[PDB]
Amino acid sequence: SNAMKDKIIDNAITLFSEKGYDGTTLDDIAKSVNIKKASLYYHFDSKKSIYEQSVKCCFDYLNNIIMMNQNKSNYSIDALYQFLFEFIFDIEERYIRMYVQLSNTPEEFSGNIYGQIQDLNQSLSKEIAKFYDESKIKMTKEDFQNLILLFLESWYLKASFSQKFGAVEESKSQFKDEVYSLLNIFLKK
Amino acid sequence: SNAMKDKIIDNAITLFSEKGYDGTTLDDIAKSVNIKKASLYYHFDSKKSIYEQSVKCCFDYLNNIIMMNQNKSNYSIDALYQFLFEFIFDIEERYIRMYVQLSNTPEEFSGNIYGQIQDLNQSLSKEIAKFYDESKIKMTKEDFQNLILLFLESWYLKASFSQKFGAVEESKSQFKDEVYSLLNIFLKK
Ligand SMILES: [Cl-]
Ligand SMILES: [Cl-]
Ligand SMILES: [Cl-]
Incomplete structure (x- = not known):
């Protein structure tokens, strides 16, 4: 336990990150915590409300990676790599996978989601x-x-892509080569 | 009918690019071309075959941007700015969205898709x-x-994202100006 609401939202972030909004069903979500579909209504009023709350949790997680970077960084050029690594290759990859899936949000209410995207960009x-x-x-x-x-x-x-297609080590290696190249571009010699 | 098969794929690209594989139904596809659903099976054996063929068409389109550039370009710095302009403005939005939608493909159908993603990058x-x-x-x-x-x-x-959150043409214009500003840093020319 002890919180069914949180269990649904944790499961929903996973389902949404894998199938997006249009591809994730209320039944999928219900199955995933072993309740009947109607019992979701004990905790939420709609599919759209489950998604909005899952998206908020996603942005909370991503913003927290950023906020935490100051307990871990001396802000030298050398610390920049670690930061870009931790943001792209975070222990929990479903969050970035979810952020990409935002592109499937009900165009209906994209305004609030759009604000969260701008806020995260500002913070980054x-x-x-x-x-x-x-x-x-x-x-x-x-x-x-x-x-x-x-x-x-x-x-x-x-x-x-690399996570989904099981090529993560090859991807981290390409990223490491590309950040090296990035530093080379902007550093004075 | 080869012409109908083509028209089904062209329409399915649009539908898939909107809701992805799991959110797109065979009913949706048949209605788009105004045929009975049974008529789909005249040209395809399953929703899976329509998607696979739609993804291939999408890469043919994207790869053709490069073929077209080879046909015309003098490869001058002017031609580099024009190629960037054409990539941002002239690639139809649905193909970009289809490409991003490759993220929610069911695992059971990973197919050759990551190979196509990596080859496009290699080719570009x-x-x-x-x-x-x-x-x-x-x-x-x-x-x-x-x-x-x-x-x-x-x-x-x-x-x-621009499709859901704000405006495709405004985004092209803003992104083009941003990219031009950065490229300008590196031109002696
Ligand atoms: Cl309950
Ligand atoms: Cl890159
Ligand atoms: Cl412009």
Whole structure:
């Protein structure tokens, strides 16, 4: 136990991350905690409400990776890799897989979800900015932020794909080569 | 009928790109072309065959962007900006969304799909390399290919999200200006 509401939402994040909104059924969710479909209604009013709550949990998790980066980082150029690794290859891969699946959200209520996406981007940009050192980096702090953000954005899909298709070690190796190359691009010699 | 089979696939790409495999029904597909559902089986033996063939068509389309560029491009710096423009603006949204939807394919049908994902990346990288010019790009060829690849591969998820959350054309314009701003950093030209 002890909280059926949380059990449904934990199971739902998994189902949604694997099949997306349109492909995940209330029956799937109910089966996954061993209750009848109608018993979901003890905890939620709709499928859309189960999804919204699962999406909030997903953003809570991702935002927390960022917030926690300051207990783990001296913000040197060398610490930047560790940060980008932890965000793309987090112990629990369903969260990034879920973020990619947001692209299947009911266009109905994408406004709140869109806000969460912008908020997460703001927070990620702010964390990247702490690694900026004008004397070491041959571009503005804004261009450095945009570059690293796009680097991470290309990897969300690439990491989801490699997880889904069981090529994760090969993917981490490519990422390591690409971050090396990224540092080479922006570091003054 | 080869023409009907083609029309079924063309429509199924659209439907799949919207709701993915599990969220798309054979009924949906038949209605799209206004045929009885039994008529689907004249050309396919299952929903699985329609999807496989739709995914292949989608990669043919995406790979054809490169073939077209080979046919025309002088590979100048001007041609590099135009290729980036064409990738962002001229790739029809449904093919990008189909590509992102490859994320919720049932495991039982992984097929050759990851191979197609990796080959497209390989092919794009080879075409990008043709624009490298030591006299104009203040980069190693390695870093130039990686930079251009991150522009193109970050576009997939942005474009897929733009459909749900705001505006496809506004996103193209904003992303194009962003990518141009970053590329400009590396041009001696
Ligand atoms: Cl209950
Ligand atoms: Cl990348
Ligand atoms: Cl424009």
